[PDB]
Design a protein around this ligand. Sequence first.
Ligand SMILES: Nc1nc2c(c(=O)[nH]1)N[C@H]1C(S)=C(S)[C@@H](COP(=O)(O)OP(=O)(O)OC[C@H]3O[C@@H](n4cnc5c(=O)[nH]c(N)nc54)[C@H](O)[C@@H]3O)O[C@H]1N2
Ligand SMILES: Nc1nc2c(c(=O)[nH]1)N[C@H]1C(S)=C(S)[C@@H](COP(=O)(O)OP(=O)(O)OC[C@H]3O[C@@H](n4cnc5c(=O)[nH]c(N)nc54)[C@H](O)[C@@H]3O)O[C@H]1N2
Ligand code: SF4
Ligand SMILES: [Mo]
Length: 720
Amino acid sequence: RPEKWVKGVCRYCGTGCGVLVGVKDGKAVAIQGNPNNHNAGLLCLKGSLLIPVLNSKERVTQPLVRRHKGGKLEPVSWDEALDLMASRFRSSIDMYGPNSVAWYGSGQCLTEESYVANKIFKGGFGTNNVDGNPRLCMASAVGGYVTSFGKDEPMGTYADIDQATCFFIIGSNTSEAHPVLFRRIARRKQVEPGVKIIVADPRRTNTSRIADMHVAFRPGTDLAFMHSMAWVIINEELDNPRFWQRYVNFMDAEGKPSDFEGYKAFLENYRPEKVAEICRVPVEQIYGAARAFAESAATMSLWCMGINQRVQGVFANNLIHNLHLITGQICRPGATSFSLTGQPNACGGVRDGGALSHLLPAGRAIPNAKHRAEMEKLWGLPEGRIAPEPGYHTVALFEALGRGDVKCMIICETNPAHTLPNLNKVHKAMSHPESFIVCIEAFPDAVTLEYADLVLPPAFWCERDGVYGCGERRYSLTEKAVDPPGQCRPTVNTLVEFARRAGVDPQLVNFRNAEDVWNEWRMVSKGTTYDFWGMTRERLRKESGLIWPCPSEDHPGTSLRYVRGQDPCVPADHPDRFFFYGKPDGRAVIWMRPAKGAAEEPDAEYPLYLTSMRVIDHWHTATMTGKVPELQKANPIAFVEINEEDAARTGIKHGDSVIVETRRDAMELPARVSDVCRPGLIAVPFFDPKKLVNKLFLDATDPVSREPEYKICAARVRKA
Ligand SMILES: Nc1nc2c(c(=O)[nH]1)N[C@H]1C(S)=C(S)[C@@H](COP(=O)(O)OP(=O)(O)OC[C@H]3O[C@@H](n4cnc5c(=O)[nH]c(N)nc54)[C@H](O)[C@@H]3O)O[C@H]1N2
Ligand SMILES: Nc1nc2c(c(=O)[nH]1)N[C@H]1C(S)=C(S)[C@@H](COP(=O)(O)OP(=O)(O)OC[C@H]3O[C@@H](n4cnc5c(=O)[nH]c(N)nc54)[C@H](O)[C@@H]3O)O[C@H]1N2
Ligand code: SF4
Ligand SMILES: [Mo]
């Protein structure tokens, strides 16, 4: 049994379960749920089996160098490693200017690592080449929220699940991707059997088995589906005029102001009978979906990659918001429009802290001259040091690296050789013989390390302290539970030593530890609509998370954003009960987004939709969950899901080896034949480093958020 229990957060999903880590003689021996965090002491199996990961010996414990392109990683000292790193970076800026260097990070870094990296790069080096994996994930949700509400992140919280009466769950396999969360939704329907659940997803997954209605639409036709719901809502007088006349503005197909009648006329392009043919669904599912959504006392939408990993991701996020805006199912307990975040710290670390190429900390933006002044002042910089132009977004970043525009790059806590789309093209880029790539990486089996020129050994997870901000705006702290192995070091300290050594002004990285950097970041937030000044380390050790806005030490935090008398940002004497203060007139915005499709659509030559998905037993590239023997008893290897009736008609039997082929590559997989995939669709997981499916996917990006469309491309299938 454990001697003591150290409070933290699950290293996995954006559910952000609180965790308590039992240790004895400086060794983690047991894990349980934080009874006081939102998850109430529960953890899925992945969480429950984190100790063998934490305890694994197959770990990167010394710095390593690759002397030459295509050589072996050999041991180097931290001292030699650091000097190398700083000299290359500095020399590169010296020769070619700061846009020759870049940071590529992740919503798995602690908020403090991403904050310090973001600062070193944007303020130290003078480049906005800071990006990271949430570009590939949540950037559509950010676009959707900013264009609809004028501020990022949901206005609701997980606690809204306990109070919803209808759940519209689209582009989300909640059961496999947010298991504790899916249980809270399951529990809700079980408490109140009257609750309706609508699961919209081209696949039929476990998630749908608690659903009253499963809408298995044709990939890429969900926009049309959601306009059509709106048509049914307005047509049957189920909308909420008192809400929308006061709190909403309308924008037409061209983004010019419009009105309710324009909305009405625009929708006439999206009648149920027409849209049912397009979506390939019975028409009664549209009426069904729209009525459930609108007649329910409280409606909550939840969505994830099926909506965001899409050239039309921003628009699809807008369409989900339109449903809530036209009904006023929002700013109310149980009624809210709630984007699910995948990673544990995409929200806290990358979106809120602004660690993307076009962003600045705490809701500020690169193009915005006043915002840069705000930051030069806060970071004590000279005037005009923050570059006025966005850096490379992710796909354009690795394209930059391929042309040699970006010469030096740090990849931190991500596996881009495994997880970027269009891998053959990326791999060529990562092989630029004149590039210098530094991987900060814990597990030696990450495929990306095959490209590293230098590899640094980080402290993993609760081998050091730091903050995670999950999908519901909870900031939760993880304390230090064990010493890291070998020569592993907290990345926070690594970054500082890196910046001092590369000539960055040391006023800029004046941090001994994560506590220091958290205190400055509290300051940078103060008086913005993200203010978490009230979240001192003292409170975060005592509490199992606080939810922002949280502007002072006696503030409990905020459940409902935009609501008078619940969100400190809304003036007590604001004339009305709601205030979408992210728009200049306090009104949220319904957008008339034309419904299109995928960037690569099926045709005679490639007749099938290919999609890619999450599996419950493996987390992403499986460098962690793959260390846990019991997590292989279901899914050891990649497979392709094929539809029963597509299989019948083309002679494919279950278990059979087939080639899946797209324009970009071809690859053999055992076929798992069923009704999971609707007809015309095939699906693949991406956990297998021996089957790198991103070789198959195209690269095409939403033009506004620059998210890739991993969810749809055109494939064909053939018996091997
Ligand atoms: N076990 C496990 N859990 C995880 C993760 C993990 O790796 N493993 N990773 C975390 C992260 S970072 C993320 S981003 C989340 C992802 O969580 P999810 O987005 O919930 O999981 P996905 O399987 O990527 O996609 C969800 C569904 O979107 C569907 N979809 C495909 N095409 C379309 C379409 O045209 N429209 C719509 N509406 N839907 C479509 C797919 O069929 C898929 O079933 O999971 C998080 N949690
Ligand atoms: N085809 C397809 N591809 C996708 C998606 C999809 O739906 N389809 N989903 C996308 C989405 S939403 C996401 S979030 C991305 C995720 O893609 P990635 O972030 O590339 O996947 P992970 O396996 O989480 O990589 C995390 C890495 O961090 C390393 N690591 C763990 N702990 C530490 C630490 O303390 N320090 C350091 N330095 N490293 C550490 C792990 O060993 C691992 O190599 O994948 C994207 N890729
Ligand atoms: S649902 Fe996510 S945060 Fe909760 S224990 Fe499971 S993997 Fe971890
Ligand atoms: Mo993600």
